[PDB]
Design a protein around this nucleic acid. Sequence first.
RNA 1: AAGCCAGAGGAAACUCUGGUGGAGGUCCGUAGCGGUCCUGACGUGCAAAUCGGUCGUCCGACCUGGGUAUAGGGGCGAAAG
RNA 2: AGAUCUUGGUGGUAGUAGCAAAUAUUCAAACGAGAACUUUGAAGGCCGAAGUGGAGAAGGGUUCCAUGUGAACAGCAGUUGAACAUGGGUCAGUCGGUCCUGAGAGAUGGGCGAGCGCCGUUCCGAAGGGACGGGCGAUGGCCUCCGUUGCCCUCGGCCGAUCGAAAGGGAGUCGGGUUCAGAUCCCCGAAUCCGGAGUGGCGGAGAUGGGCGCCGCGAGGCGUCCAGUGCGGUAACGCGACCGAUCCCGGAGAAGCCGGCGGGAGCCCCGGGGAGAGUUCUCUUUUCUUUGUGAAGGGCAGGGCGCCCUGGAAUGGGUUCGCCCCGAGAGAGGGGCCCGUGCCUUGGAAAGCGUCGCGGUUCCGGCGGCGUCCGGUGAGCUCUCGCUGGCCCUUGAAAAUCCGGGGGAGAGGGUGUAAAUCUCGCGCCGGGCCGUACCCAUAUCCGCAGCAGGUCUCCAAGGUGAACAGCCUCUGGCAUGUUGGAACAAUGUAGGUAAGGGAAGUCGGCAAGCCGGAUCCGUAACUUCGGGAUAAGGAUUGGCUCUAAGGGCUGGGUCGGUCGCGGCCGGCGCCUAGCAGCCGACUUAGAACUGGUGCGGACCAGGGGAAUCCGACUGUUUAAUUAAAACAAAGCAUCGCGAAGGCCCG
Lengths: 50, 69, 149, 60, 91, 114
Amino acid sequence: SSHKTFRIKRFLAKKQKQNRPIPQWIRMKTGNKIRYNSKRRHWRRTKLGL
Amino acid sequence: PRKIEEIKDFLLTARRKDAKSVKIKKNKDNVKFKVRCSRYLYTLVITDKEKAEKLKQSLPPGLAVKELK
Amino acid sequence: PGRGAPLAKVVFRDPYRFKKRTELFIAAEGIHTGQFVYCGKKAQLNIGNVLPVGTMPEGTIVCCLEEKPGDRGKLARASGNYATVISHNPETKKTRVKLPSGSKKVISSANRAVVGVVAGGGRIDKPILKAGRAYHKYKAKRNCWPRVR
Amino acid sequence: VFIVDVKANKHQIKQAVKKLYDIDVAKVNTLIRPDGEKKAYVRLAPDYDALDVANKIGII
Amino acid sequence: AKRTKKVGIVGKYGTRYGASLRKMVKKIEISQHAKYTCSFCGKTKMKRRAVGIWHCGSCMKTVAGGAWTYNTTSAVTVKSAIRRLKELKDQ
Amino acid sequence: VQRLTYRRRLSYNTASNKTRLSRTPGNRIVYLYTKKVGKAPKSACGVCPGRLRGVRAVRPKVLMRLSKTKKHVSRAYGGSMCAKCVRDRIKRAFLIEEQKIVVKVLKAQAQSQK
RNA sequence: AAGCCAGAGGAAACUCUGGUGGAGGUCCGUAGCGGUCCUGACGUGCAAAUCGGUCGUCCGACCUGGGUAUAGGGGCGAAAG
RNA sequence: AGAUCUUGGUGGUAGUAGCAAAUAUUCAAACGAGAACUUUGAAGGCCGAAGUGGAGAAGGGUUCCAUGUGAACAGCAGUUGAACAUGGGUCAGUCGGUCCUGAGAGAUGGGCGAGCGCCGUUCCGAAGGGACGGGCGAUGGCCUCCGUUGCCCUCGGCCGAUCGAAAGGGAGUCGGGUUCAGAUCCCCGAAUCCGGAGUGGCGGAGAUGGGCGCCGCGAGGCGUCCAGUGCGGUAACGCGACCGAUCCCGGAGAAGCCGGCGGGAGCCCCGGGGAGAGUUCUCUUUUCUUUGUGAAGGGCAGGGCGCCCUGGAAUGGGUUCGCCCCGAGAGAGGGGCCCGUGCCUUGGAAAGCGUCGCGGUUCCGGCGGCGUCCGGUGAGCUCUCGCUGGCCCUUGAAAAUCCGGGGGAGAGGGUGUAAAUCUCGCGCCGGGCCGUACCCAUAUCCGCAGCAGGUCUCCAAGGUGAACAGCCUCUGGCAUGUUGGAACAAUGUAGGUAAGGGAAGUCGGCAAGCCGGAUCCGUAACUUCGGGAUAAGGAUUGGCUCUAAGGGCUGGGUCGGUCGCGGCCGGCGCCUAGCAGCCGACUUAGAACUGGUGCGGACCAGGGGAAUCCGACUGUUUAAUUAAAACAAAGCAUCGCGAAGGCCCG
Ligand SMILES: [Mg+2]
Ligand SMILES: [Mg+2]
Ligand SMILES: [Mg+2]
Ligand SMILES: [Mg+2]
Ligand SMILES: [Mg+2]
Ligand SMILES: [Mg+2]
Ligand SMILES: [Mg+2]
Ligand SMILES: [Mg+2]
Ligand SMILES: [Mg+2]
Ligand SMILES: [Mg+2]
Ligand SMILES: [Mg+2]
Ligand SMILES: [Mg+2]
Ligand SMILES: [Mg+2]
Ligand SMILES: [Mg+2]
Ligand SMILES: [Mg+2]
Ligand SMILES: [Mg+2]
Ligand SMILES: [Mg+2]
Ligand SMILES: [Mg+2]
Ligand SMILES: [Mg+2]
Ligand SMILES: [Mg+2]
Ligand SMILES: [Mg+2]
Ligand SMILES: [Mg+2]
Ligand SMILES: [Mg+2]
Ligand SMILES: [Mg+2]
Ligand SMILES: [Mg+2]
Ligand SMILES: [Mg+2]
Ligand SMILES: [Mg+2]
Ligand SMILES: [Mg+2]
Ligand SMILES: [Mg+2]
Ligand SMILES: [Mg+2]
Ligand SMILES: [Mg+2]
Ligand SMILES: [Mg+2]
Ligand SMILES: [Mg+2]
Ligand SMILES: [Mg+2]
Ligand SMILES: [Mg+2]
Ligand SMILES: [Mg+2]
Ligand SMILES: [Mg+2]
Ligand SMILES: [Mg+2]
Ligand SMILES: [Mg+2]
Ligand SMILES: [Mg+2]
Ligand SMILES: [Mg+2]
Ligand SMILES: [Mg+2]
Ligand SMILES: [Mg+2]
Ligand SMILES: [Zn+2]
Ligand SMILES: [Zn+2]
């Protein structure tokens, strides 16, 4: 909602910040074995814990 | 805002320490003198024009005499 | 709300400090606002006065009788009801009263009571006539009314 | 416009700007961004220019 | 003109609740909504406020009375008996 | 015609969400959120039902910034009791003290015979 | 519906007539709440109970948000397990 | 090789079912490789203010905004996207939270418990840690004297921590401008609340007079003495302040639902004056749009008063739609107060808006001209204020917080350009923390989804009409609901019509059909006398031209006997069966004429009657097969119980 507590806003802020693609240079590292961010979240596909 | 009735009150209001500026507005029917104090905007309404000119030259120095026209 | 008897708001003077004490007596029928009510042993027989049963005659009837000598009113509190002082014995300091149920009880002569019948008259004479009126009656008391067999 | 610590209030922001920029400020408006950072709109005193202050800070 | 032959005030209940119950509640409602002559100021403005509470609009006197009538016959006989026992008790 | 919206986040027609229509200098109608209607004091007698005169009817916390004269009447019990019941109390006090004097004299003269 | 006004008839008791008044778990009927029938539609559906028309009630035992209390042999039930 | 075996993969079905709920799209152009679907323009429609419009709460959490991409997703497509990528965006003393308490939750004391713990919330507590008041002192220090501090005396029951509402209580912010996305928050301008000022910031009030001796022509000066915690009104009460503690009293906060009136505003309507548009085949001095003044002060209307004074009323009178009111003081006259959201004024025109131009700062709060006017309506609609009633075996919160009064403990100065004190005017300083973007739903929430479901509110135009009905339209919005094209087989779903007959169909009039609005008549049995009842039954209804009836405002003088072609008194006269003029809503009734007898022409919109059974009625019930005769109900009857008690939890 528009009304929210500080802890809720901070939680949503962190969930925004960690929902991004991987950097392109990660795939250049030695022994990567990482292809994409498999923890990507969409606001309409799945809903947050709170 | 406050409306000043007679000339004397406007005179000693314009000489207050907190008076920042005085504005002279020339309307078709009157001339409004607007001193900007700390709390209020004191307006004196002068119907004629010769008294308005006398007041224009009788304003205290060191105060902004900004003309609105 | 929830009772049929009106309540009386009576203001007394605090005898030990400068203050006004407000009580919530049960209104004996006939009392009105601006009336003086006198409480104590030397009070006279008038509607609304409170005095011990040991000081009352043998046929007087009372409004808010004490079950024990010292608590507040406990008997004949519901609207229209009253108890009757029947007999005394100055020895053993006992007094016999007739309760609204018709039972006879022996109580101390120091029990206080209001003279008169409690206001609220014959409230049970009027038929309720409606499930809704019963609903509003019991909504202000407790959750008991719609009773399934 | 500054990005400030989330724990700092308006008085602390005002005093910090005044000390480490040697300027005088009129008022401070504060919001916490959707990313969790706190953002302060610090308005300078009328005798101070925000433009040349921004120049000597180096954010032109 | 006369609008009802016999129901009078309980014509608001329509055909419901039974004739005898309506007749039984008719006099109770008449006494409930009637205005009694105040015994303090003499004006006929003493009307019921809630059950057992009767208030006069003129002198603003509130009197504890019966549920539907200003005073019940029980209370009147009680007042007379208490007066007699008071005058017997003292001499 | 122009239709109006609430200017605050309270969207329900509660007692604290009462408005009135105002025409701004920009020639548009807006809500202005009104204040509750205040009440003049009731008399301390508790008998007569009217509210006192000469006292400005405002919300209770507005009385803090009002001058003294606006909240009372230049009379004993002014701004707390009505004039009529004050006259009644004066007469009642005087007459009851007179009655006390009368009964004191009456008992002082009745004890003359042993 | 009570209450009230006027006119008329009566010895009275009172009655008749025309207005006024606006009561009621009152009626018709929206929104709302519900869910009778078509045993209609659908029945790998729009829907793990919906849709169309037709319907019941619509000043009250009315409808409803939020906050609270009652927890499993317990709760709560105008009562159908 | 099996176990309707476990996990994974793959077929036929099968290019099949299907992409059919809510009327609808078409033309041109642009970008583009590519257009039924994007964008612009034109046209035709729809939502039709109880919206497909404009904004919120809960919930979502970045979906908001701009740019770029065309992998996947958006069940066709896409140049588009709530998709992907990259950046950006939420600014507060006065909008909320925060504070208060509600239903309730919950520690401590105590009790219980093997124990984690749980019972209890005033009950089995030494439960007040505060105080302007006085003294004793430390002089800490601008040691004048006021501020510190410790102890003692006196006073001190919130008698109970604490939590509990973004819809309850709760001081005080409005107008204009501005962005790609933010504003009651930014900028501009006007205010306002709370708190603080110790060295006291300035004024004003307190508060500055009388008596006597003298001087002095008087006026006025000197000495001395005595006052002075304001003043007015018969009153209601008023004036700018107006000393005062512990304590006490009271008020506000602070109160249901419904009815009927009246005041004010906003919208709607009508008549003009402008400005800009539309039509002009003919007519139309025409049709459409638009035509401001916030908060806070001051003044004045208007509304209300169960406020005051005079006076004393029956031949009772006043008065409302209704009521109601009066020797406990009517009518009448004169006042007082409250509200004042209305009008005028400061704000204020400098702004805003509409138009006509002129310069450019690639993108100007640019500059200029003119205007922003006069009226009338009303059972109109919506808010709001007020008055007065009705209903209740229903009486419709509490607390923070603020204020008034009673009382007079004390404080203040010796007549001074005076003191204590001040709720008066002005001035000075501060208001910290958190939320603030967007959606709020036939696509941003829940239902596995862009799901015909579900989800709490605010605003609400014109016509018809009883109407927030239905139907059409304006502002605003959209593209037909997850695809199109071509044909018009059967079968279906939804909607109609059908000669003659009229339930013969069927378990059964199921379904459909008939009736239907309004006016005028006219209404039975039966009845608990209220009803039945829109019983039943019949007639009328359009258009046009009239005619009657139903109202509101003003003014009615007999005149120079004279001078403020005008005014004071007066010889100077009979509307007294009331006239003259002006203005104004709708509504009803009647008449003529008239159309191919059609007229509640669409929409809206009861089929009726005679019975039997059951349940009195209204209500409720198996969410998802049973709405009933079932449950409830009022009414009736019985039982237990006087508190060491009845019933029940534990
Ligand atoms: Mg979802
Ligand atoms: Mg039962
Ligand atoms: Mg903030
Ligand atoms: Mg609130
Ligand atoms: Mg205004
Ligand atoms: Mg009904
Ligand atoms: Mg009905
Ligand atoms: Mg079916
Ligand atoms: Mg069974
Ligand atoms: Mg195998
Ligand atoms: Mg196919
Ligand atoms: Mg298909
Ligand atoms: Mg159309
Ligand atoms: Mg339409
Ligand atoms: Mg909407
Ligand atoms: Mg977008
Ligand atoms: Mg696709
Ligand atoms: Mg994304
Ligand atoms: Mg205590
Ligand atoms: Mg709290
Ligand atoms: Mg916005
Ligand atoms: Mg104005
Ligand atoms: Mg009078
Ligand atoms: Mg202008
Ligand atoms: Mg917003
Ligand atoms: Mg859809
Ligand atoms: Mg949906
Ligand atoms: Mg789920
Ligand atoms: Mg279609
Ligand atoms: Mg389409
Ligand atoms: Mg046929
Ligand atoms: Mg036929
Ligand atoms: Mg047959
Ligand atoms: Mg057959
Ligand atoms: Mg049928
Ligand atoms: Mg019949
Ligand atoms: Mg005709
Ligand atoms: Mg039934
Ligand atoms: Mg029966
Ligand atoms: Mg149900
Ligand atoms: Mg079922
Ligand atoms: Mg069913
Ligand atoms: Mg029976
Ligand atoms: Zn009386
Ligand atoms: Zn009084």
